[PDB]
Symmetry: C2
Subunit: 405 residues, 2 copies
C-alpha cells in the first residue's frame, strides 16, 4: 500500500516586489482597513515574466536537486492556473521543454480558480496510488499572475509553487482518502475578460467560510474521531490575505468550540501564524496560495517529531477541499535546502514611479513582440542568484524564453 | 485489485447539422480534395448553445438512467475543453448545477488541446484505481465548439463518460499506456474564438505521435502487436481522411500484409469508429471519445474485444491506450440511441446556415432569441434539452426546452 505525497516543493515569488504599506500611503487607504488585511509585500510580475517563467523558476531548483534517473521518472506534469496563455495550448508544454523533462510524460493544465492547485495535487496523488507506473513521479506546478477594488490592490500578487509528488513523501505524506471536498456554482469571483478580474467580495467571503465548515464536516464523516483541535498540529489555508484567514480560523474554532477568546488567539499563534509568513510577502497567488501557506508552515513551524497538517483549499466559482498530511523532521530539513526565505529576501523593490508605470503590452493575445530586459535597468543587474527564465519574444504566437544570470 | 473504466457513455452531436455534400456543391469545391476528407455532415452550434449546454445534453441521458444512489456516487466532475468561458471558472461549476450532482464532488476543467478528454479520463481512472473513495464514480465531459476545406470538418459536440468500478462499456488495461509529449507550434487558440495553425506540421506531429505512443505502449506491454492485440482501433479524428492515411502510414511501417491488407484492416477495425465522426465533424477534445462511442455501437461485440485508442492534442501531448468492451457493454450503449439522436437533428438550409448571431467570449450582458431560426424550436426531441437563455453581469443562465 504505497505512500504518496510531497517529496519536494519550491516557491517562486517574483523577481520584484512592492512595499504594500508604502502603497497604502500613496492610495490613501483607511488605516484600520489596510492594517486588517495583514499584508506587507506583494510580488509584481514584470513584462518579461509570464506563468511559464514563474513556473520554471519555481521547479528548476527541485529538478536541479534530482539525479538523472529521478528526473526521467517525472511522468505527469500538471500546470494549475487561471492565467492561461492559450485557449488550448497549455502552459505545461513550455514548462516541460525548458525543464528538459522526458518526452514520456503526460502534460496538461487544470483550471478552477484558486482550487486548481489542489485539483492538480490530488490527481497527482491518485496517479502515484494507482501504481499504473511503479516508481513514477509527478510534478504539479501552480502559477498565477494578477492583472473593494482599492482594498484588493495591496494583496494582488504573482507567484508559483512547484510540487514534486512521489512514492517517498517526507515533506508531506497524505492521509489517503482523508478528504472532504465540496462545491456548487456561485458567482463570487471570475475572469471573464482576458487580463481582467470581476467579483463580489462579500459573497466570496461567505462562500469561503461556508466551504471551510462543510469541507471539515465532510472530512469528519470520512475520518471518524477527527477533531479540529486535536488531530492537526498546524493548519494551512487558502490565503488571499492574512486577515481572511485569521477571520476564518476564529469562525471555525467557535463552531468546533468550548474555547475562550484567549484560547483562540493562542491556537492562531501556534497553528496558523507560521503558515501566513510567506503569504504576507507575496500576496494572493490564487491557485498556488494554499501551497505557499503550506510551504510557509513547513519552513517556519516546529518539526521535532512528525506532525499532522490540516489543509483547506478554496477556489471561487466554486470548489473546495479539506485534507491532511504528515510532515517529518527530515522533510523540513529538505525544504530548508531551497532557501525560500532567502530567495524572497533578494527580490528587487519597486518604487511607486516604477510600479505606476506597470500598473498601467504583453496582452493575452499578443502575436509578435520583442521584449527589453532594460525596461527597468536596475533589476537584471541588481540580483543574479542562479539561472532564471525570462520571456524574450513572441513570434507567430510562439513564445521564446532565455536563461539569464 | 479493482476494475476500472467506462460504465456508460453518450454523445451530443448538436441540435442542428449541415449536409456537407451540399456545402461542397454550393461552394464549388474541388471534388477529389473534398471527397478525400470523408465527411458527410457537421454539427452547427446555435447562438443559444455553448460548451455547458453541449456537456449537459451529453451527460443528462446517462444521469437519467442511473439510480439516485448511483448518481450520488459521482464525486469527480472533470470537464475537458479548449472552448473555455472564463480564465478561472470551470465549465464544471455550471454543469454540476444543471445535472443536479451532489455537492460532495471535486470539479474542475482540464486543457491540452484535443488530448484534454484523455487526460481527464485517465485522471478519473486513477481516482477509481486509487480507491481513495471506494464505490465512487467520476464524470468526464469533453465538449468543444469550433483552407475552406476546413469548413466541412468544423463541428461542435460533446461526449460524456461515466467512469466506475463496474466498467462493461470499456474496461481499461491498467498501466497499458504509452504517453508522449513535447512543445511544438502546430495549432493553438491564442485569441478568443480563433484558431491558428500550421497544417503540415500538425500532420507530421500527429503521425510522429501515433508511432511514438505505440512504441511506448509496447515497451510497457510485452508481446503487443498493432495487428493482433486489437480487434478495433479508434483515433483522434479531426476528419476521416487523416485517420485513413494515419492508419495506412502505421500499417505500412509495421504490418505484414497482402495487396488489399491495409484496405481490409481499415474496413474491419477503423471504419466503425469513423461512422459518427463523419456525421459530426471535428470536435477536438471529444473526437477520440466519439470515435470510441462509434466503434462500440457499430462494431461487433458478440464476444469481449480489445480496442486500442490513440489520442493526440496539438502543442502537443499524446497517448495510446487500450481496454475491453463486452457484449453487455454494447447493449447498455445501445440504450442511449446515439445514432437515432444524430438522425433526429435539425437540418439547416444553406441560408439558415449562412446567418454567421454568436455570443463572443467575454460578453457581459446578452439576451438570446430562441426564434432566430424558427423551425428549430418547432421539432421535438425525446428529452428536455438545455439552452443558453441569457448572460447577466457575466453570469450564464440556462433553460430547459
Amino acid at each position: 500500500m504505497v505512500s504518496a505525497g510531497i517529496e519536494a516543493m519550491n516557491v517562486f515569488g517574483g523577481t520584484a516586489y512592492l512595499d504594500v504599506m508604502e502603497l497604502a500611503k500613496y492610495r490613501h487607504l483607511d488605516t484600520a482597513r489596510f492594517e486588517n488585511l495583514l499584508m506587507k509585500e506583494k510580488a509584481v510580475a514584470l513584462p518579461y515574466e509570464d506563468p511559464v517563467t514563474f513556473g520554471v523558476n519555481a521547479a528548476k531548483p527541485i529538478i536541479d536537486a534530482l539525479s538523472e534517473a529521478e528526473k526521467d521518472r517525472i511522468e505527469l506534469l500538471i500546470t494549475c492556473s487561471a492565467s492561461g496563455i492559450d485557449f488550448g495550448k497549455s502552459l505545461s508544454t513550455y514548462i516541460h521543454e525548458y525543464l528538459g523533462l522526458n518526452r514520456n510524460c503526460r502534460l496538461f493544465e487544470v483550471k478552477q480558480a484558486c482550487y486548481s492547485g489542489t485539483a492538480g495535487f490530488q490527481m497527482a496523488v491518485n496517479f502515484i496510488l494507482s501504481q499504473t507506473s511503479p516508481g513514477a513521479k509527478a510534478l504539479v506546478i501552480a502559477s498565477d499572475i494578477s492583472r473593494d477594488w482599492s482594498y484588493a490592490e495591496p494583496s494582488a500578487g504573482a507567484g508559483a509553487v512547484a510540487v514534486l509528488v512521489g512514492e517517498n513523501p517526507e515533506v508531506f505524506q497524505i492521509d489517503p482518502g482523508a478528504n472532504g471536498y465540496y462545491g456548487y456554482e456561485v458567482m463570487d469571483t471570475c475572469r471573464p475578460i482576458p487580463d481582467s478580474e470581476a467579483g463580489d467580495s462579500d459573497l466570496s467571503l461567505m462562500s469561503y467560510l461556508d466551504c471551510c465548515e462543510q469541507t471539515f464536516l465532510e472530512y469528519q464523516k470520512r475520518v471518524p474521531g477527527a477533531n479540529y483541535q486535536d488531530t492537526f498540529q498546524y493548519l494551512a489555508y487558502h490565503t488571499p490575505f492574512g486577515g481572511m484567514v485569521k477571520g476564518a480560523h476564529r469562525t471555525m474554532m467557535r463552531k468546533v468550540a468550548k474555547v475562550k477568546t484567549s484560547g483562540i488567539e493562542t491556537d492562531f499563534l501556534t497553528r496558523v501564524k507560521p503558515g501566513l509568513n510567506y503569504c504576507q510577502r507575496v500576496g494572493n497567488i490564487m491557485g498556488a496560495a494554499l501551497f505557499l501557506a503550506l510551504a510557509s508552515t513547513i519552513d517556519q513551524g516546529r518539526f521535532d517529531t512528525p506532525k499532522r497538517i490540516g489543509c483547506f483549499s478554496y477556489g471561487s466559482g466554486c470548489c473546495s477541499e479539506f485534507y491532511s498530511g504528515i510532515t517529518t523532521p527530515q522533510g523540513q530539513e529538505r525544504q530548508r535546502t531551497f532557501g525560500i526565505e532567502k530567495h524572497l529576501d533578494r527580490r528587487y523593490q519597486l518604487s511607486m514611479e516604477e510600479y505606476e508605470l506597470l500598473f498601467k503590452m504583453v496582452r493575452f493575445g499578443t502575436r509578435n513582440v520583442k521584449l527589453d530586459f532594460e525596461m527597468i535597468p536596475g533589476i537584471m543587474q541588481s540580483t543574479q542568484e542562479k539561472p532564471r527564465l525570462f520571456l524574450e519574444e513572441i513570434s507567430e504566437f510562439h513564445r521564446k524564453y532565455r536563461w539569464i544570470s
